[PDB]
Amino acid sequence: KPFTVPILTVEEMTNSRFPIPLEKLFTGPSGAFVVQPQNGRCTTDGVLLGTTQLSPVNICTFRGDVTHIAGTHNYTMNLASQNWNNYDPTEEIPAPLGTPDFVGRIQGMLTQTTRGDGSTRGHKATVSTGDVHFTPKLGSIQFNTDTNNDFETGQNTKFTPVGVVQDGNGAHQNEPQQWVLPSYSGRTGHNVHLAPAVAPTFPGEQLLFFRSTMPGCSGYPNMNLDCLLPQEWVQHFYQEAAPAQSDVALLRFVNPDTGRVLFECKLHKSGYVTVAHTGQHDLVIPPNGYFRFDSWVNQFYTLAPM
Amino acid sequence: KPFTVPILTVEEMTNSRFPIPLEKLFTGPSGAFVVQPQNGRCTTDGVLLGTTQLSPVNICTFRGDVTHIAGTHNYTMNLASQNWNNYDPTEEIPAPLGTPDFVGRIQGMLTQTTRGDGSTRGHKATVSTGDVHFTPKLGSIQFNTDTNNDFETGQNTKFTPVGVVQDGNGAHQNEPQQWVLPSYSGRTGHNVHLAPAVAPTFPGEQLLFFRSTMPGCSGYPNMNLDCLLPQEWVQHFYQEAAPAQSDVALLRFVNPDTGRVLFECKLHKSGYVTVAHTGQHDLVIPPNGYFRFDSWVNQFYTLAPM
Amino acid sequence: EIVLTQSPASLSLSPGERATLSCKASRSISIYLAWYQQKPGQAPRLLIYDASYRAIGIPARFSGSGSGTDFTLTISNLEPEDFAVYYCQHRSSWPALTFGGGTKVEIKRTVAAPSVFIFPPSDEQLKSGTASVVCLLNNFYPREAKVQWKVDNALQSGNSQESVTEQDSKDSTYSLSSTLTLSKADYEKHKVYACEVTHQGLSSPVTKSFNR
Amino acid sequence: EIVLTQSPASLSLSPGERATLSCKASRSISIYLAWYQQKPGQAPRLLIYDASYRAIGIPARFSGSGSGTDFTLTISNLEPEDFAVYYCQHRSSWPALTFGGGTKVEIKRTVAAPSVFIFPPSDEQLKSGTASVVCLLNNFYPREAKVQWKVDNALQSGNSQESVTEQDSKDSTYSLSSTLTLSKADYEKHKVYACEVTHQGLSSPVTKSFNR
Amino acid sequence: QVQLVQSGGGLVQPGGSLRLSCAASGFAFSNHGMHWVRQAPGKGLEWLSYISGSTGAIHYANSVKGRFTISRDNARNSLDLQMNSLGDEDTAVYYCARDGPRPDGTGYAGPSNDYWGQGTLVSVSSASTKGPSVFPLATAALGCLVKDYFPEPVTVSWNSGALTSGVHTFPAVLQSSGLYSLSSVVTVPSSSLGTQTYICNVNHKPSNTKVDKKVE
Amino acid sequence: QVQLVQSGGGLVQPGGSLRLSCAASGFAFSNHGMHWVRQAPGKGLEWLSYISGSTGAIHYANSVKGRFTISRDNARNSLDLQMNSLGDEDTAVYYCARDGPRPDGTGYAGPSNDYWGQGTLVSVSSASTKGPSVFPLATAALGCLVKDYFPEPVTVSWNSGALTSGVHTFPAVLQSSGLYSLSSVVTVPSSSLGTQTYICNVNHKPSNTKVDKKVE
């Protein structure tokens, strides 16, 4: 079966690491950080990796029941699955699907419904992926809210991510850190079944990132979010499951108003994109541009300069 | 080009009228209400209708700048487009793409960033699609927040929907009303360029709805949300743009664990699905089930009882 | 249309006990079945909608379950106020409503004999053209009681009338009133009269009767 | 590597005026160009990152713009503290840093003649083996000034030294110090001495000189 | 403070016509569909008619198609049922019930009526209004008997309302004469069988036929 | 309260070696990469070396590869530069600068150093420490002249610090002797050319060569 990539443009697509639209393409030099995300990881033949699932609205969300923590405004959530069934902390995944893959503080809203009378309550809440109480692989996390007396027990509760927050008396832009993985089992275990780290295996080649801007909710946060594959390509590769004729597919970026090729890049079977460039570059593209698969190539194909 | 439907299951897909996952299939008798949504409207050959766009996370969101309303906790937003360019209130659409298509009160968070120093602020906010200040076709709407002194002016502001709220000293479950359209130009104009209303043109045929549950944030709201097409089929039809060999395509719902057909339905070229059934029915389906296109059929094809 | 049978038609339970009513549908109607309560002289009261959701302001002692075809209304701890009639209702033939035959929840008591009284006709009536006699039964349970008259020891299974009270708010028993209506043509041409009163909880048909 | 040229190398502006510095790159480096300010004796100070974002705590009178290759630093209203040296910097050859040649922002003043003084050598020195004479220039602007010595009217373009002060914090002018260093071999064998002092803002080369 | 208050009904001669009315207050009337439901005495409920809030959708039971007419005026918050060509099969209590609490515009098309009317009796008899007649009855029990009376109700009391311990007033019964009949008995010790008086106070408001009578 | 405080440097004979050090306080040290930058006197900045916070990535300028060694101990919050085989091309002020404010783990690989060190001078001369020599100079102006002195600095004052109006101390200059030289002049009216005394107070701390001297 012939391999293809969707003909959607960058503005039409969605980030695979947070439920927000894409914005621009960006290439930058890897080094001083390890590119090892667990969302947006998917092979070209349809195999999902890490914490990747298919719905773009279930990224960075949580479901389950809550419990008030004595004398605080904090709540502990016992995690369920997406379909509200029980979560199995013995599944061969790093954490429940859609769980964040970066260290930071995520602000959103906790909502709850009482199955009895159909009454509802919602409160702003914050979750910090970098503290001791963030143990999603164990099924339990913590929320900081504004109320100490409104969320009931044994009821379905859902966390909906909105943005990121930075708390501090200075130290600006020190969080979130998109290339630092959380400890999915807290201080009581090492992460397991992770998606492999990715890096170009070719000097002068850099990764191409699909970049969106996360909303900020408090302070001076880092709102840039790079992903390896748009959520739409993750969905495409899964449905098509076209076998790879090689370890590297060659894509071309086309401006259909002219018919002209703007640049070419390598789509690696493992599920990420490389360009031939040196230094950080915010790519400037026509809004109609789309990627196009041309041919499968070998290990030693040399790319035209982006 | 041969017509196809995606092989995703109902849990893997997304609602086209609110950024939440689908949950179940549901058929019900049309009558006492007019099914005329403006989101999730898309023809089988790729033509989007009403306020439909492609990203599932830009449903029920708003972008622009704000302005404090004297002596209130209310803010007026001047609308921008998805790409932050200026909004054109003279475009041949009912309202900006992704704008709600139901009367109710939507709770979410307003977030703002100051381009100067990179400082951020976020506050809970509520928007009521059924009041005089809801004029998105004119480019201006109103928010009720908790602060009267934090949002700045001339800065990018984004509204992120979370759930629905019901305010009242009684009168339960009287809002939202998913089959009542808002007045996109307030009391100062009639809605224009609307997507056509849909109804079965065959007695004993009912519409098949893709149903999700909206989160509730306050009171006793109506949290059922039916859409005509999952956002993934909207995305599929747009990319494929397969010409229709007829006005009605015949789909089969298959359980791949067995290979057996559970029911058949008509996918109308205009962009909606009908089944042969009488009365409200919450369909019970295997979680692996998916739709499958079989043949184009005529106007007088009779469906097997669902 | 789809048919809804409730069963049984009557239930006798002690206050504090647990009531289990059944509704069964001819074919599937999913979860869209509602339960109603009707106290006599009043309009129906909605208890359960969508097969298992309590309506607003309903005590938690009411629980509904079921799906498809077999539905069950359950009252955890029966209170004295919950003795009424119960209708299930579906709406699969929109817009029409269809109800069940109802299920009556009766108060269960010990057996109590009918303190039978009988009354001569008034002779203020024996000049209006018609006469009538009574065979009263007072404060008994269970409601079933066969009553048969005999004019000179002849059953008159062609003319009679019957009226029952309702369960007492204090004693929780019924009471009965027979009626033998003839004219003076057969009133004074007969003189032997027999009232048949058989009730579970007696010893043998307690026969009280007449002689003009 | 990519080269960054700033232009011009020097700027003279009146306090309150508006400064426009230019950085130009050999090829595109997108928006990743940062501007630094260096007051003498101190470490660099970050003003602008990502071509147009003010760093934390920077006054709004600093504005940066540009993309690709042509970048511009703009100081809206120059304050007395903003007279320093300005470096642009990019990092396209990660991890290495590359800076520009800097642009010096000088205070612009009216023209002022050099009140020229000249000093005999001290003869406490005329027994250590070496002698030296000075031709001083005090409180003048602009900095440019050619100085040429003449031993018996002969230029000595082989031996001389020169040192300039910096702009006065009060007068905003420079001051100069010449140096003619020989030994007693040529010190007393010559006796005619000529100091050439030409400065824009004079009338004709004001020559002050010597006779042993 | 949601209310449905009915008006109309009453007695009609077989073949005649009647008009029922339901007045609504406490909610958006055009947002809810309304039903008409009848309950023959002692039997179960029977659906009659439906009219939807805004869509003007109208539906009738098969037993009443052609004879009944449903209607609503959303401006005046009223709901009317025109009943023609009645017969004794149509003798029942008639209720207006609203589709609630969820409005039509929510798509909910399931079974749920949360607010009914108070009830309005409709009787189809050819008989005419007539007063009762009281006949005496003779520890033991003695009572009062009522016959040949129409319509209903009939209130019966004992000693002007100072003797309730023992009163077992039996619900009326219809006969082949079209007129109802009743009885009301009380048990008392034979110790006061001549000491205390016993007067059953009959009252039939439909004809203003009041009757007091002592028994012995 | 973020701080970078340097140590080391000083004078070295051509061919020798030096060690530079930067001590950090006020931030997560392993989260930020560090640079070494040098500025020869009067010229522009020159990049020297980089070491990354956690990845142990190390890079050197082409001019110093093989001669310099960069290193950090994240446990002790320190950063070291080993400089071998120096020459006069290496005479400069040396700065440690951090990559900030955004940590390495944010992926930001652009140009931004928000916190530098204070500066640490490194001089590569074969000359030895030596003291100054003051020669007098003779409204007009008269001053003081300093020669044959090394290293730097040299402070010059007038009348113990009570004559600042007119002092124009000129920055030092190097010569073909390896030793610096200076001059410092003041202008005064000829009205106090003999009334008030004028004493230039030279001070050269590197050799503790203090010199006071009156001029006329």
Numbering used by the authors:
A (entry chain C), B (entry chain C): 225 to 530
C (entry chain E), D (entry chain E): 1 to 95, 95A, 96 to 211
E (entry chain F), F (entry chain F): 1 to 52, 52A, 53 to 82, 82A, 82B, 82C, 83 to 100, 100A, ...
Q: What's written in the study?
A:
Expression of VP1 in insect and mammalian systems leads to self-assembly of 90 VP1 dimers into icosahedral virus-like particles (VLPs) that are antigenically indistinguishable from virions (Baric et al., 2002, Green et al., 1993, Jiang et al., 1995, Prasad et al., 1999). Human norovirus attaches to the cell surface via binding to histoblood group antigens (HBGAs; typically A, B, O, or Lewis antigens) on mucosal surfaces of the gut (Lindesmith et al., 2003, Tan and Jiang, 2011). Extensive studies have established that antibodies that block norovirus VLP binding to HBGAs strongly correlate with protective immunity in chimpanzees and humans (Atmar et al., 2011, Bok et al., 2011, Malm et al., 2014, Reeck et al., 2010).
Finally, the third class of serum antibodies had a single member, A1431, which had strong blockade activity to all known historical GII.4 strains from 1987 onwards. To provide a structural basis for recognition by the GII.4 broad blockade antibody A1431, we solved the crystal structure of A1431 Fab in complex with the GII.4.2002 P domain at 3.1 Å resolution. The asymmetric unit contained two P-domain-A1431 Fab complexes, with each dimer generated by crystallographic 2-fold symmetry. Antibody A1431 bound each P domain monomer at a cleft between the P1 and P2 subdomains. Antibody A1431 recognized an epitope located near previously mapped blockade epitopes D and F and distinct from the site of HBGA binding. Both A1431 heavy and light chains contributed to the binding interface with a total buried surface area of ∼985 Å2 on the P domain. The CDR-H3 loop of A1431 was inserted into a cleft between the P1:P2 subdomains and was held in place by hydrogen bonding between main-chain atoms of the CDR-H3 and P domain residues Gln402, Trp403, and Gln504. Ser30 and Tyr32 from the CDR-L1 loop provide additional stabilization via hydrogen bonds to Asp506 on the P1 subdomain. A1431 Fab binding to the A/B dimer showed no overlap between Fab and either P or S domains, whereas binding to the C/C dimer showed minor overlap. In contrast, A1431 recognizes conserved residues distal to the HBGA binding pocket but accessible on the assembled VLP.
